[PDB]
């Protein structure tokens, strides 16, 4: 419970740039844009597009439970992917819909919750009931072919049902 003074504690204060000096920072190496807030589109069109994106989703998983697959296609991964699809296609509805159905075939987007097999989900529940919330051990012993980060993602989604 003490605050310290010295060169090993305080930060070297960055000097204010002169009106002729430039910061020299590459913005691309810092960020990439995922959604522009100022679109030629209306809340209605975006809402409609998200319905279409969901529709394509259910139809996709119909091509190898009706409420089940619709709810599956309604999950945030599909929605987020739809928002990205819009942005990547410069907010052209016509163009963005073609991206959803590339060659007359739909696109599937499945989160770790939906993606795991019937046996993998069963392995998870055994690992949890035995090792508590020790996820490194849960993989090392029960699901060592899954990445740890996927097991985390799956866990939190499973916490719902």
């Amino acid at each position: 419970g003490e605050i310290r003074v010295g060169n090993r504690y305080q930060a070297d204060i960055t000097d204010l740039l002169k009106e002729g000096e430039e910061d020299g920072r590459d913005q691309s190496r810092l960020e990439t844009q995922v959604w522009e807030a100022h679109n030629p589109l209306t809340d209605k069109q975006i809402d409609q597009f998200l319905v279409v994106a969901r529709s394509v989703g259910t139809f996709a998983r119909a091509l190898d439970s009706l409420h089940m697959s619709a709810a599956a296609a309604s999950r945030d991964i599909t929605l987020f992917h739809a928002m990205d699809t819009l942005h990547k296609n410069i907010y052209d509805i016509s163009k963005a819909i073609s991206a959803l159905v590339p060659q007359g075939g739909p696109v599937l987007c499945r989160d770790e919750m939906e993606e795991w097999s019937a046996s993998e989900a069963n392995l998870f529940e055994e690992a949890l009931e035995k090792y508590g919330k020790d996820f490194t051990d849960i993989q090392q012993d029960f699901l060592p072919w899954k990445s740890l980060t996927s097991i985390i993602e799956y866990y939190y989604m499973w916490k719902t049902t």
Binding site: G1, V5, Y9, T14, E31, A37, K133, T136
Partner: protein
């Protein structure tokens, strides 16, 4: 209306501190998902922050503290044990898989938004991943490994003479304080629980040193503070701060552990009272940087930052939570707002005013006209 830039990387929610640990990064993903379905995502510029490299992490930290973090893994954990004690990584701040990447996203978000602010291409910038304020120059403290806030401020000192830092987190913002303890270009204002609490600093008499004396405001508090108590001490103080310190950029840390019913915290604040600070700060129309921080009842953390983003966009959201992947997390109620508890407020009016007056004096010590 002010333009808002939001920073998020999909990976952040999947880094895990360890079994039994209170700090759960997933809370950021929860916020994110709510933001989409409340339709707020739609309304702000969304950016994916690129990883922050050792290069810019060392613009404040040690060349060999960052080098330790970049190298440390759960593999060589029994090999590094000497350096683990020197840097305080292993117990208070545990070693976990992905640790460094988690620091890169947290820092990258804060820096990219600071540049965004300096480049004058946004009015507000938001990074709920960042705001980790207990980190020191050569050690990890209180679940913070890299102080993203300091680096964010160092970038803002390039275009702004005076940078104000405000910290609502229940724990004293010592990292950001210590890092700027001897400068007059950055004022650090903090409101926290004091007395058998962490990090043991930030009492009334914590004022600064050298050029930085009278430039480190601190408001020590006891248990059970209300929205009403908090507001009636937050607005008067900050008004005086703006009046005296006259900043040109604000950095607000919106630590969510000052909320009622927190696992680690012991205040009695609702989302509404907590947001009133964000709103009040927003009203001064200064290039603003909203960061996260603590928060350990994650249902509420998600509620809090969801709401406080609506505040930045000044749009209205209903108390009905929109359906989302984690909808079932939110009790039997599925509501956005929490109400205060029966908890007793040990901050008597006489105590708050005693401190308030000492701080008004300390602020009068600054130059003005």
């Amino acid at each position: 209306r002010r333009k808002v830039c939001y920073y998020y990387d999909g990976d952040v929610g999947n880094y895990y501190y360890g079994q039994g640990h209170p700090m759960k990064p997933h809370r950021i993903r929860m916020t994110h998902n709510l933001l989409l379905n409340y339709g707020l995502y739609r309304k702000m510029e969304i950016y994916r922050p690129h990883k922050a490299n050792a290069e810019e992490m060392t613009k404040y930290h040690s060349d060999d503290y960052i080098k330790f973090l970049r190298s440390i893994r759960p593999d060589n954990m029994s090999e590094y044990s000497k350096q683990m004690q020197r840097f305080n990584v292993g117990e208070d701040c545990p070693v976990f898989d992905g640790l460094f990447e988690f620091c890169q996203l947290s820092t990258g978000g804060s820096v990219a938004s600071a540049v965004k602010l300096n480049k004058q291409q946004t009015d507000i910038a938001v990074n709920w991943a960042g705001g980790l304020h207990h980190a020191k120059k050569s050690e990890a403290s209180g679940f913070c490994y890299v102080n993203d806030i300091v680096l964010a401020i160092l970038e803002l000192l390039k275009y702004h003479q005076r940078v104000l830092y405000i910290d609502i987190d229940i724990h004293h913002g010592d990292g950001v304080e210590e890092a700027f303890y001897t400068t007059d270009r950055v004022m650090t204002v903090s409101f926290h629980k004091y007395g058998e609490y962490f990090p043991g600093t930030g009492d009334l008499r914590d004022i600064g040193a050298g050029k930085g004396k009278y430039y480190a405001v601190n408001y020590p508090l006891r248990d059970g503070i209300d929205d009403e108590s908090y507001e009636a001490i937050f607005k008067p103080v900050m008004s005086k701060v703006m009046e005296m310190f006259q900043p040109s950029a604000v950095v607000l840390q919106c630590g969510s552990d000052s909320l009622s019913g927190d696992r680690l915290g012991c205040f009695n604040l609702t989302i509404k009272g907590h947001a009133k600070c964000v709103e009040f700060v927003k009203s001064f129309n200064l290039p603003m940087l909203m960061l996260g921080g603590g928060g350990y009842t994650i249902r509420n953390v998600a509620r809090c930052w969801t709401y406080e983003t609506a505040v930045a966009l000044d749009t209205e959201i209903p108390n009905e939570l929109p359906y989302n992947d984690y909808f079932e997390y939110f009790g039997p109620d599925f509501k956005l707002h929490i109400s205060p508890s029966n908890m007793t407020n040990q901050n008597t009016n006489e105590y708050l005013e005693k401190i308030k007056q000492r701080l008004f004096e300390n602020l009068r010590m600054l130059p003005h006209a």
